[PDB]
Amino acid sequence: TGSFVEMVDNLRGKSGQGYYVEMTVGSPPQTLNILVDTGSSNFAVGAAPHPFLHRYYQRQLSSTYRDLRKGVYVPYTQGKWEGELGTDLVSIPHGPNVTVRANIAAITESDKFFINGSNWEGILGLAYAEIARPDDSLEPFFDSLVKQTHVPNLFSLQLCGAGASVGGSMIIGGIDHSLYTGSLWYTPIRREWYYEVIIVRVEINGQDLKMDCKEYNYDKSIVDSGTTNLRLPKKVFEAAVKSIKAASSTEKFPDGFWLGEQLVCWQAGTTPWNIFPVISLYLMGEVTNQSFRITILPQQYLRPVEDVQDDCYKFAISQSSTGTVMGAVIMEGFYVVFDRARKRIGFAVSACHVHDEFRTAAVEGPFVTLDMEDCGYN
Ligand SMILES: C[C@]1(c2cc(NC(=O)c3ncc(Cl)cc3Cl)ccc2F)N=C(N)CO[C@H]1C(F)(F)F
Numbered sequence: 001t002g003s004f005v006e007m008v009d010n011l012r013g014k015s016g017q018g019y020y021v022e023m024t025v026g027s028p029p030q031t032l033n034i035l036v037d038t039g040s041s042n043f044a045v046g047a048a049p050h051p052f053l054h055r056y057y058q059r060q061l062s063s064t065y066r067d068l069r070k071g072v073y074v075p076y077t078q079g080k081w082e083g084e085l086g087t088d089l090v091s092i093p094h095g096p097n098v099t100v101r102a103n104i105a106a107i108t109e110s111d112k113f114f115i116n117g118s119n120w121e122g123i124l125g126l127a128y129a130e131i132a133r134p135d136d137s138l139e140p141f142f143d144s145l146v147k148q149t150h151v152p153n154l155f156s157l158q159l160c161g162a163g164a165s166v167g168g169s170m171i172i173g174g175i176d177h178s179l180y181t182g183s184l185w186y187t188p189i190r191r192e193w194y195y196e197v198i199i200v201r202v203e204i205n206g207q208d209l210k211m212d213c214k215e216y217n218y219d220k221s222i223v224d225s226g227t228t229n230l231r232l233p234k235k236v237f238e239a240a241v242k243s244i245k246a247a248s249s250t251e252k253f254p255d256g257f258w259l260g261e262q263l264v265c266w267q268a269g270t271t272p273w274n275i276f277p278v279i280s281l282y283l284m285g286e287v288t289n290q291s292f293r294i295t296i297l298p299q300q301y302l303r304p305v306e307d308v309q310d311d312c313y314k315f316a317i318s319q320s321s322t323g324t325v326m327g328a329v330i331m332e333g334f335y336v337v338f339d340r341a342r343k344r345i346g347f348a349v350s351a352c353h354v355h356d357e358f359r360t361a362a363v364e365g366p367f368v369t370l371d372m373e374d375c376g377y378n
Pocket of ligand 1: 016040
């Protein structure tokens with residue numbers, strides 16, 4: 001670890017929208033805001049006008065553009081885009097001070113992909129080539145950056161979040177000691193596709209959810225800066241909501257609150273954080289039979305929703321059909337180290353996380369936990 005002073009505070013976002021970093025593409029450099037997504041593996045940028053884009057990548061104005069003469073078509077569950085592959089020179093101005101040639105998906109058509117008012121014009125997929133489109137031979141941006149420079153094979157994310165635009169830091173090539181307090185605890189990257197991890201125990205205010213730990217990782221668990229919610233498999237979600245309801249029973253909320261469909265509001269400044277429980281996930285450690293525990297607050301899983309005398313919030317723990325997703329609701333408590341070189345993900349208490357005078361997010365260990373390999377879904 002050390003000081004990476006140029007990359008501190010290089011992330012921005014609209015509350016409720018994703019975190020982006022400024023990048024440049026082409027010669028002379030064209031500036032774009034790029035969504036930071038550890039849940040995907042393509043670098044793709046708007047490259048034709050769109051009602052939601054106020055600027056885009058103009059290939060004909062870049063002397064260093066090279067046309068791969070191949071298309072790429074990418075449908076998601078919600079939304080889709082189509083693009084033309086090529087390469088160009090790419091920099092991150094508040095970044096590692098190096099310029100690399102990378103594959104770029106130039107997006108020429110799209111539907112429900114760009115978000116009105118989000119202020120980003122492309123997406124930086126930071127996961128591994130296995131899930132790149134159209135196939136794993138399309139080298140992702142971070143793979144190219146490391147191969148072409150001496151940047152260490154690691155990046156770290158501090159997503160700060162709101163209580164006003166949000167901010168944070170993406171440290172490319174290192175770990176900035178000023179962005180966390182306490183110890184960094186590492187969990188193995190189980191497999192290099194998404195950033196897949198293994199959860200071995202779940203507590204609500206210290207009360208064990210008491211499920212077969214395989215349920216926590218069915219069919220996977222990933223760390224995803226491109227998702228807001230903490231998303232839990234159906235059986236785990238139902239158990240967690242029941243327990244969170246009971247711990248907060250001093251106040252009653254309509255069923256639609258717990259489904260994320262309705263806001264809950266309190267008089268400005270009187271949100272009763274202390275009646276809601278903390279949520280702890282225990283992650284497999286690097287040592288045989290050891291785990292560690294990360295703990296978030298209601299300040300993370302109750303999302304502020306602004307509107308021009310009340311503070312109103314949406315519940316941001318929701319049901320998944322594709323395994324656990326540790327999204328911004330998890331990441332905003334922590335400084336998260338994606339240590340690709342050593343195949344591990346580090347968590348430490350974030351120096352910017354939102355909390356109150358009496359409770360803080362936490363990272364603690366070690367805990368004796370047996371048969372942790374049985375928690376992984378084959
Ligand atoms: C590819 C994908 C994706 C994610 C986003 N994320 C956001 O906009 C966002 N990010 C962070 C926060 Cl805090 C809030 C928001 Cl609202 C946007 C476009 C996009 F294409 N990446 C994922 N990891 C999961 O969703 C995927 C899906 F395609 F299905 F949308």
